[PDB]
């Protein structure tokens, strides 16, 4: 099934997760041919500023995510930042996410693989698409069976990311490929929200295995990535659009 | 809102090549009635990397060859100019005058094209940010152009590589009609890709939304005298045009206003 | 001799050329081991805006440059924009300059070469350093004997140029290399003036055959490239600095 | 304003390698009394591209080996850490704790280093703009660091290539002491250059102005187990250090304030 990974960027509160989770559950009942996976980070471990929001800790976050899985029967994903975190996170996370800056950290990758969960690696803004073959090879060496690579943009001069859509067919040679619709048009340190939907249309027309998109009931109040979180109320329309474009374009997806 | 398809062989290798490709584009134009086809070929490759590479058979020969395509098949014509004096003779045959990407800031060339009364299509320089095309359009409007296109053809991304930033399409749409160049956007300059990425990125362009696509084609690309690595085999053009019409239709209700 | 190419960006008036030319003459008498070449453009043929200053025409410009050469006995350089301009310009210009955007225009290069003058090609912001070998080959084919390549920065995302100093030793394989201190830190469409002197120190420490630097008595009033023209009064100090650093560093310039 | 030279073999291939290089750096430190030498070697290459590549002999072995260099030669020591728990044991031997470039935004790693009371040297990420190092320094100051360096090691420039934007040196100097990494700045990541550009770009860095240079060195680079293409032969270190002291001296009166 096509994957849709969605949720609020950060675990701002169990309350926020339950509100978002309720809508993701409703959509999962409406779009049965899509596999939904609920995402939220227990820690923003790489904020630019020491004064910015990080979160409420790994214990609180894992608990809140457990509530979402229990209340709604949704699969769960969250990111890890150091190797020791893999095991406790794997108790709740069906997919362990590796942050883009950390895509080359061998121990983090091996720790995630050791848990027996699926692993989704964000492609570093410094990595070339062909450079991801070695990422997959580490994860296979560590025992991983279900592996995703996520396109999230590439450094393009200062304070800008570009999406090179050539990466989608290149990375598909060795893993399932997800397109991150949210952070790919985030300007680090043109934009931004106005480009989210057009580029997710591009990703599906080119061909991918799923889309990653963050959502919040009121984006302007979000504590992380406010400029690019999608309003919750817009998610349904975008998902239906994704599915329609994929239905038509998929006739033309090239083999391997 | 007829979608534009600009297509033809990169260079005017011979009048015979032009008529062979023209016959196919004419056949497609009769099938895809919802498309406006414009036939393209360059009478001069004025910017080749090497002094030893094919340039062409001269302006007079090329205009005559293009005129024969227009006469025989009733197709609109486009070709590129390189210095201001070429605008006048070229406008005798060309419905759309093309401005090469490296020359997109050359004021005199832009004005020369604009005062002919023909449509003008400027290739966006590999050095230019999408928001900086606003002034290119202003120059053309100042010079009398009433029908203006901007063509996305990739941006310098380190050495010998171009990337297509698809954010450029909605940005440039604020000021002109936008064409996606499927051929030169995946060329690696000075020596992906390349051919394997042409069709995926065309699909991206139409899903994002554009007003036309530019695609070069040759019966036998391996033998072409210019851009051999990226010209589409002529037999593949029909299938690609059908795909972009299908993808455009399904994506179109989602295209953002303005 | 080390080359210093300097002058006001645009021929704003014969008056401006004579004021600048007077100082360049004085410096040429003070620094006898340097070859000075006076630069000014008769046309800014590639301005972003239709409303910006271009100049007073080729005839006026060639005349003003002739006045500088006659009054001060200085060598002259100016840029051309279309092939027909090479011959009339060559009447006064010792070095014909090819603009960066036009570095691949075969006819312009051949027209410049045909005049028998030296030719200095600005390296396009799109060109790789190894890509310049073919530029030199065109000029040799057209009869040119004295050929320069000028480093002027490379496209680095949007509205930014970076100087890759690896280009200096690479381009030296096939031509004399000039470093453009002015336009290399011009942001098209960090910066800017504060970086001019530090990067010209880098260029001389790496090793080049000359430096190109634009100057105006009152930069803030200049009609082109105001943000990067050096105040005339600062030129002497920078030249002396160049020469001192070159004297020491040249011990280490690698062969070929 | 003693200039810093950080030098040593990329990886702790063996304690024996360390002592061989250490003996030479000690000899140079006695000649170039105006330089503060800091000996560098990594106990772990934690970010290699391939699972098959050399990583090292473990933290305990590496710290012991570094301690032997400090004991035998009286040299200051630096090494890099990869996860927060390493800061404490490493601070037992390291005068300067190095933060790898990909990890320059990892708040916990920065704080772990800062609270040790050791100096901290952060490699600027290949993704980071020079003005965005201000917040990296703020994090370290918040965490108690009193001696902070920022190291220029190149910026992503298309695929598999780094460029050094020397404007970064005066920009970063606003907030920290600045080191130029002569070795990794010309490495082509994931497979110029390379070695032929090391010395020219060091000359550029000192002419622009910096507070130190970082240079890896191995008696026989061809045989090194990491960064073999860019490690300097040990016999060349003396000549390069003399050149940068000469160029620094002649350039120094021109270094801009602040
Ligand atoms: O959680 C994810 O999926 C991510 O991609 C991580 C992403 O949210 C982070 O890298 C943030 O974008 C980043 O910390 C925000 O940066 P800043 O607003 O602190 O400058
Ligand atoms: O004619 C067009 O539409 C163009 O975009 C011009 C384009 O064909 C040219 O820039 C060629 O790609 C270029 O001269 C070929 O370069 P090279 O093979 O000589 O290195
Ligand atoms: O004359 C030279 O040496 C040059 O390098 C040409 C240079 O002055 C021009 O490219 C200008 O920098 C350019 O027209 C100014 O751009 P803008 O201020 O019109 O956006
Ligand atoms: O130790 C340092 O100072 C560094 O800058 C770390 C540096 O050695 C590493 O990033 C290596 O360059 C990198 O693991 C080598 O990459 P690869 O040869 O495995 O592709
Ligand atoms: Cu986020
Ligand atoms: Cu072509
Ligand atoms: Cu100028
Ligand atoms: Cu190293």
């Amino acid at each position: 099934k096509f994957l849709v990974i969605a949720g609020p960027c950060a675990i701002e509160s169990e309350e926020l997760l339950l509100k978002v989770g309720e809508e993701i559950k409703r959509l999962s009942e409406k779009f049965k041919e899509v596999e939904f996976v609920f995402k939220s980070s227990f820690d923003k471990a790489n904020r630019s500023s020491i004064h910015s929001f990080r979160g409420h800790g790994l214990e609180y976050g894992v608990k809140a995510l457990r509530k979402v899985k229990e209340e709604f029967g949704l699969k769960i994903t969250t990111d890890i930042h150091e190797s020791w975190q893999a095991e406790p996170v794997a108790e709740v996370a069906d997919i362990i996410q590796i942050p883009a800056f950390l895509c080359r950290q061998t121990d983090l990758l091996l720790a995630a693989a050791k848990t027996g969960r699926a692993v989704n690696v964000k492609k570093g803004q410094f990595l070339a698409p062909w450079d991801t073959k070695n990422v997959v090879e580490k994860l296979k060496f560590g025992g991983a069976k279900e592996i995703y690579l996520t396109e999230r943009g590439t450094t393009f001069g200062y304070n800008n990311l570009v999406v090179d859509f050539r990466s989608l067919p290149i990375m598909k040679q060795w893993a399932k490929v997800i397109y991150d619709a949210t952070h790919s048009v985030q300007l680090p340190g043109g934009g931004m929200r106005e480009f989210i939907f057009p580029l997710i249309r591009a990703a599906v027309a080119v061909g991918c295995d799923g889309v990653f998109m963050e959502t919040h009931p009121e984006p302007e109040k979000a504590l992380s990535d406010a400029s690019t979180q999608l309003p919750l109320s817009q998610l349904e329309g975008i998902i239906e659009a994704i599915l329609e474009i994929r239905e038509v374009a998929s006739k033309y997806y090239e083999t391997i």
Side-chain angles (χ1 to χ4, degrees), chain A residues 38-232:
Chain A
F38 184 92
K39 184 266 172 172
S40 196
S41 293
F42 65 83
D43 184 25
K44 309 313 292 189
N46 73 162
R47 300 299 306 260
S48 292
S49 176
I50 192 59
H51 297 120
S52 289
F53 182 76
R54 294 192 58 179
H56 297 111
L58 150 11
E59 288 190 4
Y60 181 99
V62 160
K63 195 151 65 61
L65 290 165
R66 195 91 229 21
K67 195 65 173 39
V68 171
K69 174 177 263 185
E70 280 164 5
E71 192 155 316
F72 303 113
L74 289 171
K75 282 185 180 206
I76 292 292
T77 188
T78 197
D79 48 342
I80 58 164
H81 307 102
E82 296 191 330
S83 300
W84 66 268
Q85 302 179 330
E87 179 184 341
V89 166
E91 310 271 61
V92 66
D94 298 271
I95 301 175
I96 293 174
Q97 183 177 120
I98 300 297
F101 295 158
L102 310 181
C103 68
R104 277 184 55 173
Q105 302 309 298
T106 302
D107 291 332
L108 194 64
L109 294 170
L110 293 174
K114 192 184 163 177
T115 70
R117 299 303 206 163
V119 183
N120 174 199
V121 182
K122 302 282 206 87
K123 171 165 63 56
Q125 295 92 331
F126 44 86
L127 221 56
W130 39 88
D131 296 339
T132 60
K133 193 183 177 170
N134 278 159
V135 178
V136 174
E137 180 186 41
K138 293 184 185 170
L139 286 164
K140 287 197 176 172
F141 175 88
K145 304 272 92 185
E146 185 171 340
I147 297 165
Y148 301 91
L149 289 169
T150 295
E151 167 62 42
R152 54 103 70 241
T154 302
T155 293
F156 184 60
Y158 297 135
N159 304 294
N160 200 182
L161 295 176
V162 65
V163 182
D164 184 356
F165 285 94
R166 301 175 294 190
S167 77
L168 268 44
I170 298 166
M171 295 193 293
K172 183 48 165 181
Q173 298 177 97
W174 41 69
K176 288 166 163 182
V177 176
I178 304 300
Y179 172 64
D180 177 344
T182 300
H183 306 101
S184 276
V185 304
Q186 254 145 353
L187 294 213
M192 289 172 257
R193 181 176 282 106
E194 69 194 285
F195 300 116
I196 292 169
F197 192 16
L199 273 51
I200 199 167
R201 300 196 295 270
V204 312
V206 172
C208 55
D209 297 294
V211 173
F212 173 110
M213 55 181 159
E214 289 176 352
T215 191
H216 193 285
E218 315 173 80
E220 77 163 44
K221 298 179 170 168
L223 302 185
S224 176
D225 291 329
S227 310
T228 51
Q229 297 208 241
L230 247 12
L232 224 202

Side-chain angles (χ1 to χ4, degrees), chain A residues 27 31 197 232-242 244:
Chain A
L27 268 12
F31 299 110
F197 192 16
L232 224 202
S233 64
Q234 289 175 21
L235 188 65
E236 178 183 336
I238 289 176
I239 291 164
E240 172 63 20
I242 283 174
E244 298 167 355

